[model samples]
Target: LAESAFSERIVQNLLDTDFYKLTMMQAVLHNYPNAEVEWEFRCRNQEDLRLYLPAIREQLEYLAGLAISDEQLAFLERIPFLAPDFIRFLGLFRFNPRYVQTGIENDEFFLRLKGPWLHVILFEVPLLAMISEVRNRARYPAATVEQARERLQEKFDWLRREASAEELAGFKMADFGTRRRFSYRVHEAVVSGLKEDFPGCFVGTSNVHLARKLDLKPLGTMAHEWLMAHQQLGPRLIDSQSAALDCWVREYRGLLGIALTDCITTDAFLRDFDLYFAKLFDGLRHDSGDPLLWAEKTIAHYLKLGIDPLTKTLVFSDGLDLPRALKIYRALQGRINVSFGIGTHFTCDLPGVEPMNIVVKMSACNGHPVAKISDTPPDFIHYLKHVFQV
Candidate 1:
């Protein structure tokens, strides 16, 4: 009951503030006593025990004037495991070892799982991989095959250590610039680069024949551009969202369906066309505005449509990040059908902001608190902290 310290105060504050009905966490907890169970089942098989049982049990034993039991430790080992991709997720808990256990129960843990689980699952790894590839390629100008291999091995090893076992296994490593933009020679170069550095790790491009060549999953979806092009056939064709969606569906039948949803109205697009997709369409794109809000709407709409809450997902674009997304989910009471598809934001944007000279030199050369010198001078840089510099 670590949260108990604030429980009474929280209750009193709610009552005194003239909003007894707005019980917040207490009200939500009351309604769904086993909310964690629902989260554990769908959150890639995660539960509280996997996150906190070991520490909680140890703390309780000490408080009760008893030694920690070996049986408890053995039991603790069986809580519930995280996916390899998610093992790195424990870092979100400030690197708490208790959160890394495999067989954790749902009741003892507390963490906000933000946005849709699909966002983290599909986009995060691929985005990270692409950025890593690009960064390494940029840094090593005259990189030989062996050098590339070493670099790839270094990255793979770090990622393996960073991510969970399940997450690592679940990661669908792919590169998507082929068949259109980058030439086959360039594609072959990418394949060679991956083969030299991280063999058997990459699933290659999403193109079927290309996937066969590179030995990867053909992971791609038909473009909304195709639908737009089909709309040009006026007399023979009509401009309808439903028809466009259906055509995309037919184009990718029997394969995983990943249709673009935001080409039409942002809010109503997915809500209107999801049923036509039926069970086949595995994913939808969120390209326009307020991905988190749109995702919440998508999940709510899908739930009403009898779609298995777990199967169908909405992939958000652009401004999807960890903390902001978590806050939005908190606002929505933690619905978990939305996934992310971050491109320029995380990869291109975060780098420019995070690893600056000021940040890198914040601590000081001798590891003592040092006064930071303003590079842009105080006038211009004064407002930096209030806006983007943080």
Candidate 2:
């Protein structure tokens, strides 16, 4: 039944391309003219992709041999939406089935798209523009390459231990407590829901106490309040943001750390971050400013602060979404050491379910498989009548 529903949604989506999306995009863009909107739409039905392979092929052909600017090429490279294999395929073929083939499965055929395909497609153009905008912004003061290396050593020393793994951050929707309503129930419900709804996504919880309840991996960073608490202990070195990083250092010690930066404008938060802790200072949280610019400036700042360019990580989350996150990363190529921590967009801002239903059964007419939709709109009824008549 679930698979059937998924397949139905895919078909509806394809059909609605003519009826809905075209009209919707225009209206949406009208309001947020400055915002980038990327396309991430794809068939949830593997059979649909196959049935529509011709359309895909035609589209690819149109896109194939097309001249993309060097900027576009660079942007494409950083897109997590385009995996290494997909990128390689894009380099060779105009259209790649591997992109759809690798996606989520409603049935054995439909699988999750390997990466954020719909996301990249939707906002690629706006992203290119955003990148140009970023270029015009003042370059964050930078440290020489050699200085970054020395600082990295100092950072490693600060960690008091060797660092092991580094993960590129991504925008996550689950952070907003979207699936399950309450905090206590969120641990179990949200994790299970993510595994079901959005595979390949890292989950986060806001109810700090519920952290231990969920068997799922928990991701977090130090809050600004902790720094204020330390200041209450009396002023000592640097500012609160640095102090917060220091507090993280004092407690977590050798563990990888993520620090929140919203307390004092993100820039001030990071101003002295490098000087305090070293190795364990794994990731920086940017709760404000354009994530793409913040990512670039933060990376440049870390390097200038003499931190190891490789050791530092950026964990950005200011109303992030898969599309925005992809756009930012795309613009930077694979150079930025940033990960995402999507909070509101995923959990809080998802669209509510509209009135719709799909039912399927063995056909009474001619003993064949049949599907049906019962709805108010004249077209829906008209389509149902047509399908039933056949």
Candidate 3:
């Protein structure tokens, strides 16, 4: 009777992207609204996506035509620290396809989004989610609803069986997998399961749409792009990282206070952190390098500044799974606040299929090339290490 009730689009809502995208976009709207930026997509798997071009293109078209619905805007209005003007900006926001182009390059998939930073900034995640769904649905159709449900349940079971009572009581985690989710259905399943089953351990999510639909906290602040874009849009290359943090402090004051600390590497970020940032921001997020070292370094930074370690939170979002998360939580128990943002592990962990290792990084800002050294592809920019002494 309601077969026609389903939505047809891949990324049906602008809120389907990460929470960080909105926070960072809001910052951009206020600070660098006129900045021109370019995003380049890279696939680490090297699989040919040419076969799925038509489907991918159609999805991109669908994405480009989408706007944040009035209902969605109302949902965002409920989220704290989202400025009224920023909410108003999103109200008028829509993806401009003219800024995006897709095709084959070196016999693999090639896609790029180029436009004003504020205009194309939100394209990064939705495009990735779209490509992932197209590839998994047709090329590797090994998963079914029942199969995914079982796998999802198995992880929760493992968590319940293995995690210490204290670990479960103290642990906090959120979904960071929308961009590479196997499918919206699978992601929705994970969120709903966590919402109903392990609401204590499952704190929130990075995806905004699901945060609203499932009535969970949208947990994110700024991403690496905020700092990376500052590489070209800034006070100076050496001070850019500090400049980025300074600007963020100026913008949100102290509401969305988790600073991402590996855009240039943790060491460089620590140097810029100083007491001003060390005491100002609530905590730091680790996206690259060893989580243990990051934890040690982060704790030491707080201690070095005469700040209490337990007062701050450390978020680990680097290729995490349940086992690693449990281990990290156990090691750092009672020492400091530890949180995890798990990606493919929660959303794309099919038994036989390998999830695509893909990313759409901010390649250029204002016509100048910007790059990240740590946890990024082996490329140029050794001088940054020399500049920041990383």
Candidate 4:
């Protein structure tokens, strides 16, 4: 029997997605307008997503109906680096669902979103959140709201008990849980509590809507696509990483700093991240490897460039919760400034259910396939490692 998911109304507006989604959208709009892209949904935990395809189809179809309003555009106008033209362009932009196709291929459930890069880019974050919320209600039941809250409080209490209030000076964290959040309401509850309880430390969220609603900072910069898409949009395969950075620098100038490493593995990124990029961008973001080793490389890179490591930051968003966040914070506190963008730990976590490990990443750009060989999954894209010497 198919579960009824019509009662679910998770994504309310366009801003319900992450900050970087919009950031990169504007970048693509200006630079890669005709660039056709393909995004593939892949899960790490290996769930048979076909079980919930019915609900997911209807859920995502409604997303194509979503549009931006004057209210939302006005909010984006204040984001500093965003241009007046791009914000107005967003006012006129609406998602076209035709760009997306859903099915099971080779017995693997898949979501293949294809179209002009500008048209299909925003779907990744919201679709993940929608699929996650739909499955949560169907599989686990919302009664765990109480259990989730209990766990949220326990995690909050642990921070108060074990970490010092002044730790905010050395350590800052934000909610990066929108994509894997249990539900919209739970995402709100966690952020609301964090905002009130840990004001200085809980800097912001990746969700733009919640940032506006809760009056919190909307923090994020680039993602894997910003780096990976450059594989084809390049001077050379060897210079693609730097080419991505050079274009981004021209787009935002000095704004939206914090380049994401590990799109082709952090090692490859370093070859391109010379003194110019290191000095220009505010910091680096770690997504797919050992945080400690990544940090050592990060700090070493800055010092080797004759830049002070203390002056730059390494934003850790790999896989974090209070336990690991604090551990990493304690380990690197005085060595370099750090920030944690925690996802499933703060949002999707409930006492009984397993958190969904999902991602929808750019598989191809401008008609050719591209790959971001991560440190966590070191495979097929091995030749690029030979070229870039990763």
Candidate 5:
């Protein structure tokens, strides 16, 4: 048998990332074409595990050599929300190895990516995925196929049995697990099982490649980076939220219109989310704070603007699990449309193991500091704000 088996690879396609990456990339290309940015990778887990930096670098080098194939371009070209120009950009896109630097310092691993924001924005998810896979594989045992399948099946059965058909029918979710998936095989198995068993409930996935392979909807909108970059690049920090929304509306023209609302605290975000924006956007996404409270506030905001809450959607995507999603769904079923973008719960639910909490966030843009303050530790936030000047 060949030493390098097909199943042993970390990333097979350039599209193995969240759909929002492309959305953000297109917006950056159209609006901030000349902006330069820097991203830093961080491992949030406190567990003592040795990370092999050289091996991780080799994986990234291999990723740099990969490109979007003609078939992938054709698929991207067909997405209704993707512009023709952005599709062409994908055709020409290549991961530059020089843009990323990986090393170990003081018994800890660090990876930094600095380059044009438009070109390097796509690297975040894939790099996190590679780091997660490399670290976990070194520290844990590979889960058996039967174990993964049974876990997925059990979850699906529980949902069906516990909830009424009407409540179950209204439930919708997508896999937001690419950055922290246990492995490609594990994610594939879980997604495939969900699609086969609960077609209506398991609406889609954020992984573009897997969405295509499974013939499902590619689900995502903007992420925190869009708003964070604007905090530094916009005319002023207070006006940046509105400016970011305006730029997104200008480029997307209301397609892919779900806005993330916690980059600088949801309260600060709502100050700029006026009646015009509330009516213009399709919905709002929550990534931090209490879910029920956030949903109530969102509904109140829309009602205060004289818009019907039922017409808009509220997507919950913060550290979600099945029971929590169900609880929120039951609480807000008739008032608003709710959906879930679940991460580690779906992709990293291995037997007898815990998933690592890791992230690679954009730290600076155009030599200026940009910060995302929601759910991040106070100490780390202080470091980014004071030490890194973000």
Candidate 6:
């Protein structure tokens, strides 16, 4: 039954996870080597689908049993930006199963991970991918190869028509769909199609293994976990934003320079983002707030600091589809460089299967609660607070 429930282990390679996992891992290794943190998983949609916890638990056991291979370690070492010390750390790192806990609460499935920030941070993407595949297998019927390829072509056609040549030429986009992908095969097919059809527009992917396999750039900077972990530093919650940014700059310098805004709120972030940081960092990533409003505020902040907005990039990775990305691209065409880190829309857009609105976020660090307060919709915010108890 366990084998039938989870026929295949979805997360095989350590690099199959997101690029940010390694980026944030290195930063945490340098800064919070022994800091404790807790991550809680929450499913926003109220779908009455079957999710067997024991099978999921078995999958986690398999994941914990995995160790970084010598080949994979060699590949990581070759990344031009990755430090030798960090690659050495990867060679010695392994996932501790004790960090993960799974259970059924009030007829809803829940997974919680608690451990050292460096160790547990690796679980987010892999666990989400496993959960998504398990649920997709159970609830949705399989799409034939023809169906999958046809849908991808249809989506590509729409994108080509909707996005003008100038708009496509100016804008950059990457696939950020690991967490909610329909399946690994589908994700590969979609990425391959995009790369072949829209070579100019489709730039890279967040999945490290796929990026390596397809010879595409592995693209990602940082995630909310980096900022959330900083919130745990005592009495420095207000200043944690700048502290995290400073630590990242110290680690990667300007190589991975897009600072994630709206961990607390964009306004609060801007208050601390003085002229020094505004210019030191290359760009800003908008995750939670209004994209247009966030872009406008970013431009104003850059100009206020006497920096050229055109020199910096604005990455919009907040629940974007092609149409939404085109709209944002057209609105902010020449004012600044724009890119979209699109998730769900690219990989989980199967014809009949509705994608799950699920997320696993950092709930606490060092026994202190960390909250992700942003410009998210009121109803969703209320749902997060009430359901996740963050």
- In Å, residue 51's CA in model 1 sits off its true spot by 58
Models, CA RMSD each: 27.0, 25.8, 2.5, 3.1, 3.5, 4.5
Cα lDDT tens digits for candidate 3, 264-285:
8787788778888988898988
lDDT of 4: 0.83
lDDT of 6 by residue, 116-151 (tens): 988898899988888887777777645544455677
For model 6, the superposed segments whose C-alpha errors exceed 4 Å read: 1-8, 48-50, 378-390
Model 4 per-residue lDDT tens digits across residues 1-390: 332222347886999999998989899889987888888888887788888888888887788777787888799998878887888888888888789899888887888889998888888888999988888877876344556667888887887788776775556889999998888877887788788876337889999999999999898888888888888875677788888999999999978999988877787778678888998999998888899999998888888899999899889888788888888999998988888889988887777678788888888877776787777853436767778775
Query: If ranked by TM-score, best first, what sequence of candidates would result?
Result: 3, 4, 5, 6, 2, 1
Clashes of each: 29, 27, 0, 0, 0, 0
Q: Rate the local accuracy (lDDT) of all candidates.
A: 0.35, 0.37, 0.83, 0.83, 0.81, 0.80
Off by over 4 Å in 5: 1-6, 48-50, 375-390
Task: Give the deviation of candidate 1 from the true structure as CA RMSD.
Answer: 27.0
**What number of backbone clashes does candidate 2 have, counting pairs of residues 3 or more apart or in separate chains?**
27
> Which consecutive 10 residues in model 3 have the weakest lDDT in total?
1-10
User: Which of 5 and 6 is ahead in lDDT?
Assistant: 5
Model 6: number of clashes? 0
TM-score of 1: 0.40
Residue pairs with backbone atoms closer than 3 Å in model 3 (clashes): none
For all predicted structures, in order, the TM-scores are 0.40, 0.41, 0.95, 0.94, 0.93, 0.92
True-structure lDDT of candidate 5? 0.81
Model 4 spans > 4 angstroms off: 1-8, 377-380
